[PDB]
Design an enzyme around this catalytic site. Structure first.
Site, mmCIF file in Angstrom:
data_model
loop_
_atom_site.group_PDB
_atom_site.id
_atom_site.type_symbol
_atom_site.label_atom_id
_atom_site.label_comp_id
_atom_site.label_asym_id
_atom_site.label_seq_id
_atom_site.Cartn_x
_atom_site.Cartn_y
_atom_site.Cartn_z
ATOM 1 N N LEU C 36 -17.914 49.018 7.925
ATOM 2 C CA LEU C 36 -17.105 49.720 8.911
ATOM 3 C C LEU C 36 -16.973 51.197 8.567
ATOM 4 C CD1 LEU C 36 -14.222 47.046 9.017
ATOM 5 C CD2 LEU C 36 -16.291 47.064 10.413
ATOM 6 N N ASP C 37 -16.675 51.990 9.601
ATOM 7 C CA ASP C 37 -16.210 53.366 9.471
ATOM 8 C C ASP C 37 -14.741 53.436 9.895
ATOM 9 O OD1 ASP C 37 -16.033 53.758 12.361
ATOM 10 O OD2 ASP C 37 -18.052 54.555 12.430
ATOM 11 N N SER C 38 -14.203 54.655 9.952
ATOM 12 C CA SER C 38 -12.754 54.812 10.049
ATOM 13 C C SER C 38 -12.206 54.371 11.400
ATOM 14 C CB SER C 38 -12.363 56.259 9.770
ATOM 15 O OG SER C 38 -12.555 57.143 10.868
ATOM 16 N N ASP C 40 -13.549 51.958 13.238
ATOM 17 C CA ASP C 40 -13.682 50.511 13.260
ATOM 18 C C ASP C 40 -12.598 49.825 12.463
ATOM 19 O OD1 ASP C 40 -16.081 50.590 14.732
ATOM 20 O OD2 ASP C 40 -16.986 51.386 12.887
ATOM 21 N N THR C 41 -12.049 50.499 11.468
ATOM 22 C CA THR C 41 -10.947 49.938 10.717
ATOM 23 C C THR C 41 -9.633 49.989 11.486
ATOM 24 O OG1 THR C 41 -12.120 50.568 8.711
ATOM 25 C CG2 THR C 41 -9.788 50.072 8.494
#
Ligand code: NDP
Ligand code: PLC
Lengths: 355, 123, 81, 185, 128, 89
Positions: C36-38, C40-41
């Site tokens: 994940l990237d930011s 997606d978190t």
């Protein structure tokens, strides 16, 4: 900017010798150069077709009978794009006036019931013959004639008999004519399919709910007609516009009642009784379910394999289950919320009677 | 006094990218949480996943901006749009400006090479 | 504990963007597993909160940075423990 | 022509059974209140039939005019959730419902007669066969109706219950204010 | 068959005449937005009721007792001669006892609507 | 005698076996009083007696006050809770 998505080029020459130079980017104030005549523009498919034609500045001639049923078409285009003429198939000067100046003629005329003045023959065969002889006299470049599915010269149903005879006289008078065979069209304010399934107090079938067809969205049929209009590849051809998936009426009613969250009522009473009830209800003045429709209830779709299809037009239809939500949600009641338990203790924190 | 509306945020320009980071992530969270409301209020003919996909697309559009003040302006306008959408101020007509992909295919000839555009006078 | 990580690990692969289809574990970082990237978190914690029928505050949703913290937050019985 | 209006008591009994069933059965409680109104109409009819139209009009103006109005007033203003009549929820009641129906009806019909043997106590209740003779006397000189006599006895022979109903109505004013209103100080 | 009975039955079982005339004569081809309801407007799945002031329900709850009072005065006005100077005193006591409750209702201000956002009436005092 | 006993018994059963509403409880109480009053008035007519009609008009008044008080109590319950549910009175 806007674009002429309907045209492949901007300089277009007709089969009659007219040079049509498109003017503009493709918006309301743009003009393709084309003139058209849509003979059933007041109706269900014709409205969408005229909208799609006049969005880009195709000069649509709309022959009309009732002054009040057509008014919504003038909004579809700029000033001078949609032109109205008063017409009756019992007046040949009317038809010649309608088809004189056109490059494209589209006959979408057809009734699913017989009237005092127009039987199935008089509308489907003789009217088609009159329009086709006008189209031949004036050497119109493109003539695009819509004949219902399961059309066959001698058939159980007089509707399909007369539609096939029309599809013959058109092709015999105007050999360069295109014949488009749509399947049962569904959509918004449809004639006898979904709005009827969702509003009717009780559906009936002389057969079981067992007639099978591939239904198609009216907007995609209109798009296919739009593509046939400007594609000169399509002269002297036949099209079977039928759609992706096969369904029975029972399957579609199950879908409708799953979307609607209400139990659609159906009866399934015999043929000799329903046919007589329909024959009796033709005595009132407003449209009702015709006896030939309960005849067609036993005639499932037989697709002609020699006829062209959507994919020849680079079109991929939608199918009914993905659009049933969009089309039936106006009749969805939405009774109440889900599981109001777990609402008590949060509701306890609000003020409900102001002191 | 003249009090603010439901989901108003006072305009406060961050003096740091690290604080505006948190502000932007909170706004993203709020859009995602409100997408079901956007589908119920506006009679939307498509998925809630589609709405969240569109939100992610519009947040990715300005992902590699580095000027702080431009990011501040973008955050402020994003919060304006959130307040306009969650409070039923927009109509369906303006909400569906973001969603041209969901409307049916615009005709047959959509050029992507030179000769197409030339024949249509778009080169 | 087996109430919740079932559905957690389900929604983490319901999330398409994970390159892996089956690297999900407790002790999986949302970020340096590089699943994940930011953004997606926040998408994943959103999916989790409306999986469990809840909404997480803003100082605890940023703190849910791995699958440990997720299950331990749902452990507080906000609803559908 | 004579006996076209004979069974108009039986019809009211039938319609009352129907309206009670619809009260129990209606999905939305607003419809239950409307069927209660219809039952009041049926009772008012029956009261006209047996010769008490004054009570029919009193019922129309009190029950339907105030009490049913207040019922509608509250269900228009309050959230009253409802579970629909179901077979997975209510079918368990059928044995006890039937037992109680039989027992309660038979006891309610037995309780009105003074005969010693129990079976005969029901058989006298169903002994509605013989007609009443209505002879005419000439002794009543005044125009006294039922309402006049109610007033006479209520204001002379029974003045105490009227002056106690006054305090009952005082409660009807003072209670709801105590329960609904919040006094500042 | 009296003219009273004829009229009171005829009005209901004929009142649907223009209803049927209108149902048979008039167009009916609905739209979605013709089945709609307003210029703008919406509401999510928030609640089924709005918070209301107490007077709104108290007027209805107090209509019952005062209506019963005024309807209980009907026996008196139909018995006024026969209950001569005794029932008169009795109904006067009745009315006085029921006026005490009306006095209570007025003095409590139970049908008054109260306002939350008061106007500020407190002085402006500056700590020096 | 018959109509009243029937209304009374059916109202009592619809009160006892109500797993749905509180409004149905109110309605069943009112219909029970109605049934009693109808038996009472039929006996009043047959005996040619005024005590029955007096008791009946008194019941009308008392039932009105009962309805007023009951629907004030419901309003207090709703003041605190905000929703009157299928169960829990
Ligand atoms: N809808 C469907 O499911 C299917 C339709 N089709 C065919 O495709 C076409 C689509 O029509 P549809 O979309 O059904 O909507 P309509 O059938 O309502 O379109 C009907 C048109 O025909 C015109 N028309 C009918 N009779 C006459 C007449 N005697 N003289 C002049 N004009 C007339 C009507 O004019 P007015 O409005 O003035 O009556 C209207 O413009 C028709 O040919 C139909 O048979 C085939 C298969 C399925
Ligand atoms: C009587 C009124 C009902 C008439 C009716 O209902 O008659 C209607 C019929 C039906 O006409 P249609 O062509 O088949 O309708 C076509 C569409 N269908 C097939 C769905 C039905 O009219 C006729 O057949 C011709 C008779 C003309 C009657 C004109 C007299 C009007 C005078 C009215 C005086 C108040």
């Amino acid at each position: 900017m806007n674009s002429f998505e309907n045209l492949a080029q901007d300089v277009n020459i007709t089969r009659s010798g007219k040079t049509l130079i498109a003017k503009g980017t493709g918006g309301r104030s743009s003009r393709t150069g084309y003139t058209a005549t849509v003979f059933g523009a007041n109706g269900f498919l014709g409205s969408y077709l005229t909208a799609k034609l006049a969005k880009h500045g195709t000069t649509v001639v709309v022959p009309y009978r009732e002054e009040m049923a057509k008014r919504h078409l003038k909004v579809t285009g700029d000033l001078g794009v949609v032109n109205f003429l008063e017409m009756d198939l019992r007046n040949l000067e009317s038809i010649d006036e309608a088809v004189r100046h056109s490059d494209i003629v589209v006959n979408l005329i057809g009734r699913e019931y017989e009237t005092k003045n127009f039987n199935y023959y008089d509308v489907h065969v003789e009217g088609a013959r009159r329009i086709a002889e006008a189209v031949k006299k004036h050497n119109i470049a493109r003539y695009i004639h819509v004949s219902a599915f399961n059309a066959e010269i001698d058939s159980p149903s007089e509707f399909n008999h007369t539609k096939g005879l029309g599809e013959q006289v058109t092709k015999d008078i105007v050999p360069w004519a295109t014949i488009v065979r749509p399947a049962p069209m569904f959509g918004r304010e449809d004639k006898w399919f979904l709005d009827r399934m969702a509003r009717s107090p009780c559906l009936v079938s002389a057969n079981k709910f067992q007639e099978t067809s591939n239904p198609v969205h009216v907007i995609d049929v209109a798009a296919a007609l739009e593509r046939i209009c400007f594609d000169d590849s399509t002269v002297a051809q036949t099209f079977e516009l039928y759609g992706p998936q096969k369904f029975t009426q029972k399957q579609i009613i199950d879908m409708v009642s799953e979307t609607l969250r209400k139990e659609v009522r159906h009866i399934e009473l015999p043929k000799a009784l329903y046919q007589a009830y329909t024959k009796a209800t033709q005595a009132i003045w407003w449209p009702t379910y015709s006896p030939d429709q309960v005849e067609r209830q036993f005639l499932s779709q037989k697709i002609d394999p020699s006829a062209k299809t959507f994919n020849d037009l680079d079109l991929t239809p939608m199918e009914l289950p993905d659009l049933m939500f969009k089309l039936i949600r106006p009749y969805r009641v939405n009774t109440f919320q889900h599981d109001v338990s777990q609402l008590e203790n949060k509701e306890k924190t609000f003020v409900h009677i102001l002191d | 006094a003249i009090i603010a509306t439901a989901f108003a945020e006072t305009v406060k320009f961050s003096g740091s990218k690290q604080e505006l980071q948190k502000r932007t992530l909170a706004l993203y969270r709020q859009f995602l949480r409100g997408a079901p409301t956007f589908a119920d209020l506006y009679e939307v003919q498509f998925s809630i996943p589609t709405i969240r996909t569109k939100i992610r697309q519009e947040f990715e559009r300005h992902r590699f901006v580095d000027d702080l003040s431009i990011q501040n302006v973008l955050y402020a306008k994003g919060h304006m749009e959130y307040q306009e959408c969650i409070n039923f101020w927009k109509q369906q007509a303006q909400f569906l400006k973001y969603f041209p992909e969901e409307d049916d295919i615009q005709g047959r000839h959509q050029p992507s090479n030179f000769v197409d555009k030339f024949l249509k006078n778009r080169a | 504990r087996p109430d919740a990580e079932k559905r957690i690990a389900a929604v983490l692969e319901s999330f398409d963007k994970i390159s892996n289809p089956a690297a999900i574990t407790p002790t999986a970082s949302f970020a340096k597993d590089l699943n994940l990237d930011s953004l997606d978190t926040v998408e994943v914690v959103v999916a989790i909160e409306e999986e469990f029928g809840i909404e997480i505050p803003d100082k605890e949703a940023d703190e849910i940075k791995s699958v440990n913290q997720a299950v331990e937050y749902i452990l507080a019985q906000p609803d559908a423990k | 022509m004579m006996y076209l209006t004979y069974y108009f008591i039986e019809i009211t009994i039938f319609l009352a059974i129907l309206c009670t069933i619809f009260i129990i059965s209606a999905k939305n409680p607003m419809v239950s209140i409307l069927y209660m109104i219809a039952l009041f109409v049926i009772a008012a009819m029956y009261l006209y039939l047996i010769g008490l139209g004054i009570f029919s009009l009193l019922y129309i103006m009190i029950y339907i005019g105030a009490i049913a109005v207040l019922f509608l007033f509250i269900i228009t203003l309050l959230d009253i959730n409802s579970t629909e009549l179901s077979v997975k929820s209510n079918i368990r009641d059928l044995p006890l419902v039937l037992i109680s129906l039989i027992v309660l009806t038979i006891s309610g019909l037995m309780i009105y007669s003074n005969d010693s043997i129990l079976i005969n106590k029901l058989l006298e209740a169903f002994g509605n066969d013989y007609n009443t003779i209505i002879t005419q006397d000439w002794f009543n000189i005044e125009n006294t109706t039922l309402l006049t006599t109610i007033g006479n006895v209520l204001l002379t022979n029974n003045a105490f219950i009227l002056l106690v109903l006054a305090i009952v109505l005082l409660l009807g004013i003072i209670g709801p204010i105590s329960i609904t209103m919040k006094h500042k100080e | 068959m009296n003219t009273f009975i004829i009229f009171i039955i005829l009005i209901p079982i004929v009142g649907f005449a223009l209803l049927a005339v209108n149902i048979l004569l008039a167009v009916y081809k609905p739209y979605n937005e013709k089945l709609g309801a307003f210029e703008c407007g919406l509401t999510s799945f928030n609640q089924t009721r709005l918070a209301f002031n107490a007077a709104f329900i108290l007027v209805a709850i107090l209509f019952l007792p005062f209506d019963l009072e005024i309807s209980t005065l009907l026996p008196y006005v139909m018995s006024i001669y026969l209950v001569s100077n005794y029932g008169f005193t009795i109904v006067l006591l009745f009315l006085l006892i029921l006026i005490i409750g009306f006095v209570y209702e007025i003095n409590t201000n139970a049908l008054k609507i109260n306002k939350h956002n008061k106007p500020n009436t407190d002085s402006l005092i500056y700590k020096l | 005698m018959f109509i009243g006993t029937i209304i009374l018994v059916l109202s009592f059963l619809g009160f006892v076996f109500n797993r749905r509403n509180i409004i149905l409880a109110f309605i069943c109480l009112e219909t029970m009083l109605l049934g009693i009053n109808l038996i009472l008035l039929r006996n009043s007519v047959l005996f040619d007696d005024i005590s029955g009609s007096l008791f009946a008009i008194v019941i009308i008044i008392l039932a009105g006050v009962e309805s007023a008080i009951g629907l004030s109590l419901l309003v207090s319950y709703y003041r605190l809770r905000g929703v009157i549910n299928s169960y829990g009175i």
